[model samples]
Target chain A: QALSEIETRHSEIIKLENSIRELHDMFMDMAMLVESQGEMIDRIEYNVEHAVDYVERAVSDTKKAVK
Target chain B: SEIETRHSEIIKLENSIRELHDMFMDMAMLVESQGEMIDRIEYNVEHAVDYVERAVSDTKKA
Candidate 1:
């Protein structure tokens, strides 16, 4: 609403000044979410790698005479 | 303090948009990695079940 009001009534520069006050917060919020997703991805990838490796080795052990 | 002011924060937003946009592109790759990684996980899950079944039945005689 402020942005809309500013757009309607003010010069582009002033609108921008007002907008940055809000835009910075928006960017901050996005960055936080994005960073959390990245962290989760790293963890998921890590555990997946280990799970794949262990299951594969177990698969091999079950085969070809290691009973 | 150093003097600082943008001629237009909208233009600053333009640059900031670029930065965030680049982050988004990398995020796209991260998302793709999730898909690919899940495929391998599902594949391993398939094998794990197979092996567990075999380990139970086939090794009993030996």
Candidate 2:
């Protein structure tokens, strides 16, 4: 009885460990995707800031030309 | 001519920025959902560990 029961619980533990590993992999994948998206967002923000600055410079130049 | 061109370009860039913002929001939601899934999985594994520990203890007692 003891031997069979131990074997049964050991199998169960193996299944649980596999599940934990799978979840860990999934979590890592999601984390990577999140990081990539964050980088893309940062780049876009930088470009937008530069675009705004360009527009501001154009306005300033236009005013100086008029003056 | 300069103002008009810049204005149009700014409008287009604003649209692109908005789209990127929306994409980020969607990714944020996905990350949140994944986080929740991880939490649930962690809870289940903890419970399973407890059950296994109890089973081992019982076996030893017997």
DockQ of each: 0.08, 0.03
Minimal lDDT window, size 10, model 1 chain B: B1-10
**Fnat of each prediction, in sequence:** 0.00, 0.07
lDDT over C-alpha atoms for residue B6 of model 2: 70
Question: What is the lDDT of every predicted structure here?
Answer: 0.64, 0.64
Per-residue lDDT over B1-62 for candidate 1, one digit per residue giving the tens place of the 0 to 100 score: 22245446546768886687677667667666766676676667657766765665555445
Question: Candidate 1 — which residues are off by over 4 angstroms?
Answer: A1-67, B1-6
Residue A27 displacement in candidate 2 (angstroms): 2.6
> Per-residue lDDT of A12-60 in model 2, one digit per residue for the tens?
6787677557556655676797676566556655655665565566556
TM-score winner: 2
Docking class of 2: incorrect
Q: Residue B53, candidate 2: how far off, in angstroms? A: 67
What tens digits encode model 1's per-residue C-alpha lDDT throughout A1-67?
Answer: 3558557656766766775666566656656766765676677667657766765665666685655
